[PDB]
Amino acid sequence: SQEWKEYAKRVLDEWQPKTKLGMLVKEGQITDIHEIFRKGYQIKEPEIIDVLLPEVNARENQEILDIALTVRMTDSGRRVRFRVLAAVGNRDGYVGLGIGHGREVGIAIRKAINYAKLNIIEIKRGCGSWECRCRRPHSVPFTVEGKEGSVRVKLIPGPRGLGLVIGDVGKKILRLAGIQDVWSQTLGETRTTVNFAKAVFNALYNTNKVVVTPEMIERYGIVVGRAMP
Amino acid sequence: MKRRPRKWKKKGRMRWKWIKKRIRRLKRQRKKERGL
Amino acid sequence: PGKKAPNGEFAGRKLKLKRKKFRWSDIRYKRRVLRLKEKSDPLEGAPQARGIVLEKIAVEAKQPNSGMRKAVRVQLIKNGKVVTAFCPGDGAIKFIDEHDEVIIEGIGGPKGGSMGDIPGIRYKVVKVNRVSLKELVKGRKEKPRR
Amino acid sequence: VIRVPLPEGNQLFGVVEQALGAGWMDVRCEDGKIRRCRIPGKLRRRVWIRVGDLVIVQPWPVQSDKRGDIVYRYTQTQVDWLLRKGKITQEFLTG
RNA sequence: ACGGCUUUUCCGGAGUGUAAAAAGCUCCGGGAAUAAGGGCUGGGCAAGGCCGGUGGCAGCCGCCGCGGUAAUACCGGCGGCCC
């Protein structure tokens, strides 16, 4: 994990902010990722995360779902541009997702890889299926659901070891956050890879929309972000 | 005539009123026409 | 619409009635109970049959293609029905003479109907005079009974 | 010599009595038989056919009455030149 | 390519098995000797931008789809992937 600390000294000196949060990370007060989120700041410059999540750029926390070209007409023929769906996040607890556009497949991919650096959000975890009574973050804690477009889906815990079981453009974006074993009930139309992606990721957001009282914390081993490096 | 209103849309067909009237001219027939 | 029809405790009888009725509006249910695939099926619902040939004709394909596929007409033995057999294998038509006993299979497409460009056929050849046709497609075997 | 498409092999001359329609061509040779020819998509495309437009055709061993497959109509440049030699006789059009 | 070694299998042979037999099964005697098809090879779906024939012709196609003289999508051959 060396290079992904060398990048900190490579980057922190080679950039001046244009926003404010830029400063409040550049000058040594806030230096730990998990204390910038739950306060309603704004993320507009895509380096603040790199300076604290410097493994997001590793070509392995990065995943590229699909390229799809779209068309429109003008009175001089066709005009055509690409959209790629790209998601990223370290393989510990944090994931982000972006679309982007552009007129060439490169510019598209890079633009999207950048957009998906800002939205990035964090999770909870657990193990609370009726079998894995263990307490180690290898499954989503409690059955929750999320909606988008014309697709609903509700995730269910499951025992340590049952391999990922969801559609083929869900296995990636579940693998990134490392959620390994989880069972799937689908509705709607799973053939627009986009709304699929966005609905799954929305559910994983909603993971933090239910109140778990003090005691239940030590029933499923809920965590937040990294746990036991 | 136990209407089925998906047909009036006139898309790739002909009007409905002026098809009913022509089916009558054959039901009145196969009833009258030696259907005795 | 409201909650649901007999969503009470005791009215299960009505509920079984509701399901027993609305089950019929299907299409695979009916085509089985009433056994309609039976008694409209020039083989009486079986996986193969034998026949005799009558002619040698040719058919044209779907709208956006071009060609004249060859075709034969078999007269069945099980029923006296007269059914339409297509034969694959380039130029296989060089062999099927008038009055040769042949075998007939399906073509296994949508619903069991036809497939591809030849829309009007439903039956293809496998064996002639007890000889597997794929052979004569690449020769590789000789032919009995002339 | 000259490229006037002599009936090669077993081509037939078809002067049409009427296009029975939609590719159906009721054609006529000097045989005694009145035929029903059919047309490809190559020439249903780039050329036009009318009554009195002689074409060459071919049979299939079926029925010896109504066969025929178009591979070249004739040209007005030779439609009558082919006569001066005597390769086509003109009592199969004119009563 | 050469050098060593093996004997489940295969040929001979005995014991033992069996109602009588046949198999098997312990021993010897021989010897790399006696032992490979099938389907695929345009996207679905692992796999050839490889060569040689064919001219909206022959043909392929579970669906969408190729064939107009320059075919990864036919016919071959050469390569190649799944059991």
Place this chain on the structure above:
RNA sequence: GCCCGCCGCCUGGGGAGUACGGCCGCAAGGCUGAAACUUAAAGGAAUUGGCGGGGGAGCACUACAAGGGGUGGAGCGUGCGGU
């Protein structure tokens, strides 16, 4: 929209609201309603553009108005059609 009741219909598209049979009507007709087979999709909501014998804004002697001079009609030079 979220919760507790009962009820009637729909389950690719056509062939079809046809067929055969019963029930009321004086008639015209009305209520009940299948199947053989044929096809790969018919239908919805929105997005750019082209067009409109739809509406506004703004042009041009290869548009008109207002003026000047002509070709079409004759012979000939010269380019195409065709024979």
Place this chain on the structure above:
RNA sequence: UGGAGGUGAUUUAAAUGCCA
């Protein structure tokens, strides 16, 4: 800010289009 409804008007003779 945008419509949401109503009363009137609302114009001679103008048919059709292979081939990839």
